[PDB]
Design a protein around this ligand. Sequence first.
Ligand SMILES: O[C@H](c1cc(C(F)(F)F)nc2c(C(F)(F)F)cccc12)[C@@H]1CCCCN1
Ligand SMILES: O[C@H](c1cc(C(F)(F)F)nc2c(C(F)(F)F)cccc12)[C@@H]1CCCCN1
Ligand SMILES: O[C@H](c1cc(C(F)(F)F)nc2c(C(F)(F)F)cccc12)[C@@H]1CCCCN1
Ligand SMILES: O[C@H](c1cc(C(F)(F)F)nc2c(C(F)(F)F)cccc12)[C@@H]1CCCCN1
Ligand SMILES: O[C@H](c1cc(C(F)(F)F)nc2c(C(F)(F)F)cccc12)[C@@H]1CCCCN1
Ligand SMILES: O[C@H](c1cc(C(F)(F)F)nc2c(C(F)(F)F)cccc12)[C@@H]1CCCCN1
Lengths: 231, 231, 231, 231, 231, 231
Amino acid sequence: NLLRHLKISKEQITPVVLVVGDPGRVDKIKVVCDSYVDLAYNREYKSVECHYKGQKFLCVSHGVGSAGCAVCFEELCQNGAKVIIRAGSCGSLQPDLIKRGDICICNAAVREDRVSHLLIHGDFPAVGDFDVYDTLNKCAQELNVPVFNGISVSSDMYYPNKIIPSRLEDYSKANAAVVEMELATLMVIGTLRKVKTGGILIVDGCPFKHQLENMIKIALGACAKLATKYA
Amino acid sequence: NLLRHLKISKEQITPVVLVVGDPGRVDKIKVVCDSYVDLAYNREYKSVECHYKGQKFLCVSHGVGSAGCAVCFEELCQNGAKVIIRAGSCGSLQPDLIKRGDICICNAAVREDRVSHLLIHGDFPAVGDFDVYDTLNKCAQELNVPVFNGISVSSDMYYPNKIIPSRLEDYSKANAAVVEMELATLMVIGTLRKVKTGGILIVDGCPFKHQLENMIKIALGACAKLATKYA
Amino acid sequence: NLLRHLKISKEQITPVVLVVGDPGRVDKIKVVCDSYVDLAYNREYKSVECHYKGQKFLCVSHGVGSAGCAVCFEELCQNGAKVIIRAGSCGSLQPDLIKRGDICICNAAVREDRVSHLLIHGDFPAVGDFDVYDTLNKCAQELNVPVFNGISVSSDMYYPNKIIPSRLEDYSKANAAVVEMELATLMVIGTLRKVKTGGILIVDGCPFKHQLENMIKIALGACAKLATKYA
Amino acid sequence: NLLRHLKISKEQITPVVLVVGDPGRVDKIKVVCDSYVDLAYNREYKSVECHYKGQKFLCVSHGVGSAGCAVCFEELCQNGAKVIIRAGSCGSLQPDLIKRGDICICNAAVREDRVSHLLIHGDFPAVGDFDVYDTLNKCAQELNVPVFNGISVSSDMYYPNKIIPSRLEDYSKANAAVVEMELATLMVIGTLRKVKTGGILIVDGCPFKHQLENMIKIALGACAKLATKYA
Amino acid sequence: NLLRHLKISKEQITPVVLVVGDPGRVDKIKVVCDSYVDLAYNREYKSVECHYKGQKFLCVSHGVGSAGCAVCFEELCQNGAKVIIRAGSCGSLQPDLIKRGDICICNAAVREDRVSHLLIHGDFPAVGDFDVYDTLNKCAQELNVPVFNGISVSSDMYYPNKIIPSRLEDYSKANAAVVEMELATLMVIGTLRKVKTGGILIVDGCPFKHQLENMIKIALGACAKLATKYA
Amino acid sequence: NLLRHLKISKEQITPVVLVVGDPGRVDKIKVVCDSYVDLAYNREYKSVECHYKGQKFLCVSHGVGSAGCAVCFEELCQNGAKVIIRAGSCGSLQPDLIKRGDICICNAAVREDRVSHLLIHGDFPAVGDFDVYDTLNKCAQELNVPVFNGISVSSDMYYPNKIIPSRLEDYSKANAAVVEMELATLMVIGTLRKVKTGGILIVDGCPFKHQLENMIKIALGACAKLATKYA
Ligand SMILES: O[C@H](c1cc(C(F)(F)F)nc2c(C(F)(F)F)cccc12)[C@@H]1CCCCN1
Ligand SMILES: O[C@H](c1cc(C(F)(F)F)nc2c(C(F)(F)F)cccc12)[C@@H]1CCCCN1
Ligand SMILES: O[C@H](c1cc(C(F)(F)F)nc2c(C(F)(F)F)cccc12)[C@@H]1CCCCN1
Ligand SMILES: O[C@H](c1cc(C(F)(F)F)nc2c(C(F)(F)F)cccc12)[C@@H]1CCCCN1
Ligand SMILES: O[C@H](c1cc(C(F)(F)F)nc2c(C(F)(F)F)cccc12)[C@@H]1CCCCN1
Ligand SMILES: O[C@H](c1cc(C(F)(F)F)nc2c(C(F)(F)F)cccc12)[C@@H]1CCCCN1
């Protein structure tokens, strides 16, 4: 009784799941835990059980882009996952303030996908669980890692054309901090299925004009903290 | 140099502002503080300086509905206000779980207004500041008052007709907790102007099928806590 | 058996109602009638029975903005009101032609609200009753007061930002005369509930780059004329 | 220097124009005037100069549907026409009240076209000139012909399918009286170009479940009345 | 048992129909066939039975614009027509490449109408039948007539205003070749009713900055080829 | 000078590219060619040079979903690819007619993504190149493999919820044949960048109520045929 795309079973699903885009990132994360168990690898979806600080939680890759990741997240959320934290990279939308390697823990997101709109009307917020956000922030503080907080623009467009103007500049003026491609989708799906979500991101560019290791530490720390509550 | 609709001046604006819909509610709130100073009353917008736990903060009425309240909130946000907490009433969207007199502290809202859409594209979240939410929650806990947390549906429609179906049932299924008329507007305006916002509401009905005093205590407590940081 | 927000009863509702935004305006209007009876004051909604030229009609304040005023107008329309005329202020959209203190009697309006869209699809016109418009015009003429006629832009945005362009310039080029915030809402609600509506406005600004007394006279005149038909 | 589709020249354009859909209707109208002059016939656009009650005005066919008629109306409005009255047939949207052969003089219309939306944002009303409406009504009264007044639903769909529900039932509940295909387009174009418009229609069906001659008389009467003002 | 607007009967409908906008074009086409039979002329809809290369097919005029032509096309498609090819004129959207008199055979179209949107959601393509396109192309080649291939922008706006920008420039950059007013409507209706459609157009202008006879030959050739299959 | 996500270089890009969703599918395809060269594997994007019938063309995996695949397709289209054919699986939208294992070669698609809408207005068709479609069809015929032809619904939603109705039933009634998740995106991107595209799909389910090998043969055959033209 395996999940259709993750090819893992319901019993293999822990309460806390760390998600990342790249299956290769799962491999670099697992070796930084105390131990791990490889579970499956199907398409872009790679699943490993991570063991860290006496706690147990999966790390799963979701692929690039909202529709791809919705299949991952739906399979998790409908099969016992209670907390999903996305860790990844992003573009800065405030290049004067937030620079290469800076880390942003996000509370909400702009819904520039389609799938969330196929699930619920556009007016509904893409918003993470406060507790997951508080936990992520507290782990950062404990490790003395400075971080930013803010809204991420989640967009299905990576390569713009020159016909329809990009809204990234509008959202920068609206004080959105960063840009990526899956957080909003995660948050809407999460909310609809009673799954607590959050997101922590490392800036690796700007669309306009050691830190990684720390980001990962923060994310694994938050997962261990959250996991403790369900064990 | 008075504000056009609030008829108060920039110097009279404290860092923290409590907002409520009804000017009569301002009067019932002020007398529960240690002392107060009546500042102005113009149209539906009543402003009083509240004194509570050694702290100083305004209580301002915003009127019914999103466009009316946007004029209030814009005048505050553009003239020195740093934290705005809305306190009011709402309908329950989960009548089995959340009942008459229950109190909900909200993290985000559904944007069923127009004014927010005239300010920023629909995909952008209506989301409150986490710190304001954490503060509100902590005051509740300190007073041993149980509370719910969740998304509020902010709608410009109070009296439905029978032509266009209401989305309230959709949003209830999407796990939105409550319904009111101004929170989303507050949150978008707040975000756009770098003003930290939040909302605490008391259930007084359902669109489908002592506690007040406690709500007010929580709200005044959070305002005093937040105010301390800027004095 | 009181109306929920107006706090008046069905029997207190006359066939003709004059509506204005500001409760203070009700007070300045009532004293210009032959006599009056104060009925209620709840939130921003102030109701007074006006007596003028042997006729009987209410003057009710509706607050600022479309959602707020929809609660007022729905309570009136569902409880026996047959004719509602809004009197108020507006911005000029044709500053070369229509200046400070000029009076505009409006036949239709731009629906830049939300509530009307929650009632009926966007394609439907916001249009006043011709008879109410003809009456308003005829009273103006009788008093030898010059007036303009045209479409009003009804917008939920008073304070623009600099992200999303305002449509006010588009509508000025489309030959819309004035701008305000509630007429469209009135007209749609009116049409949906078989209530005859209209609007007369005095210019008090421009968003781009004695007369009051006369406006009020015109409005009270039209109300007396219309009221005569139902008594 | 002929108009591109009407194949008439600017000098041949009178201040008042009667428009109808069918070129054959122009022929049946012209012979009921005192005299006439055939001007042109190109595609569906037939133009004749009508002479009636000592007055001079064109009767022009506009074809079926909004985009077709917009070319007619734009050529008229940009080349000296001041008043355009559409006369035609329609479906009843209130079959209990308004029956086969009843005549409706319309004040406004539902914009279920595209071309008007390519000219101006959806929120803007399709509304006729009050004076043209008053004139049409007064001619009816003079001839003792009973008439209805109301909003027409102007739709680009004549033959519905069974996938997307028709809004005709919604608009019937919204108290729209009749349905046709060009009035809204006329009214928007009219408003944008400072041309006074109106519409008088005879019911010839229902989408749900002697009089002609009188309609035509009313229309020719109104044209003669309006024309007198510019001669 | 006549069709309501075409005024022909079901038995008079051939499997292949050539459609054109102008009823006068039907007259110039019929005389180029081997023989013909005039069937009807009602409003802008002129129907003639064409006889060419031993084959039998109608030529029908559809009028200007999408809503008008939808009535024509629906009456054909619901009454036995299997193949509809539109032949007409268009504007070039690539003036450097495609010039006056050049001929474009179109595979798909931009849906800038309303009626198609009243039939099926905007996301659905306006696309012709490949076989009809292949046939049209092969007839061109047989007659050694050079042709272009591409998407046509079908727009309900002929005369732009200066408020809402035209999308024609956007679609030119998107590599749309030509512009006209009815192809998209034909293609959607065709697809919905299982009718095979296509379009061949001759450039006669640009919105920016012998060949006819050949176009007609190509169109009559394709109709004869297609007709052979059903006889 | 490697492509950012494909991690191949411009010189490694052939004129014809076969694309598939699953990187594992690339592996099963390559071994069926005469020979191959593994080029790269980064994230879900696996690239191999295929050698077949004396011809040279890449096979590249694009991942699940529209936004993910747009990064793949944009990198190809902007770096020398002239023909992209997608081969994959789909759901049947006509379960009576089109069954498990049946193969559909698609001419156009429904744009239920977001990224295409961020590139060009919704009215623009998602349509493949006719020549690629003709080639695919001819290879099928040569191998005596029966196939269907039609429109695919491309949707970003795989797992529906029960709040917002799925349009799949609407599109089935509109005669769309199949459903998948990337074809529309491919086709729009293709059209915008002057890249010829197409799609061949094998039915493996229905959302309502040997053949593989043949599909692959057809796809490799079409790629070899198309490649011959550029070598
Ligand atoms: O989402 C991450 C990301 C996205 C985008 C955006 F969507 F705006 F173009 N920009 C990114 C940037 C950018 F340079 F800011 F543009 C840097 C790092 C990651 C980015 C990447 C997207 C490609 C796949 C990996 N995630
Ligand atoms: O926003 C509060 C409120 C709104 C609405 C809604 F918008 F859904 F109809 N319902 C409320 C309810 C309701 F009964 F749940 F419907 C109770 C108490 C306050 C409500 C009120 C609205 C009227 C003015 C005072 N705030
Ligand atoms: O609706 C009236 C009004 C509105 C607006 C608009 F919505 F465009 F900004 N502009 C007004 C102006 C303006 F100056 F034209 F902008 C003058 C007087 C009244 C105005 C005011 C709005 C604030 C509350 C009282 N009614
Ligand atoms: O606009 C007139 C008309 C339209 C429509 C509608 F658009 F709803 F289907 N219904 C009509 C009806 C109808 F029967 F009510 F449906 C009767 C007479 C004229 C009608 C006709 C439409 C066909 C061309 C002549 N005008
Ligand atoms: O559709 C044909 C057409 C349309 C348009 C457009 F819709 F863009 F304005 N432009 C055309 C042009 C134009 F000059 F390119 F603008 C030339 C020839 C026919 C055109 C004409 C439209 C008027 C009625 C006859 N078909
Ligand atoms: O796009 C293919 C596909 C999609 C969908 C849809 F989007 F409707 F749900 N349904 C599919 C079906 C379905 F069973 F018809 F629902 C079968 C096989 C592939 C399908 C799959 C989607 C998951 C990732 C692989 N492609």
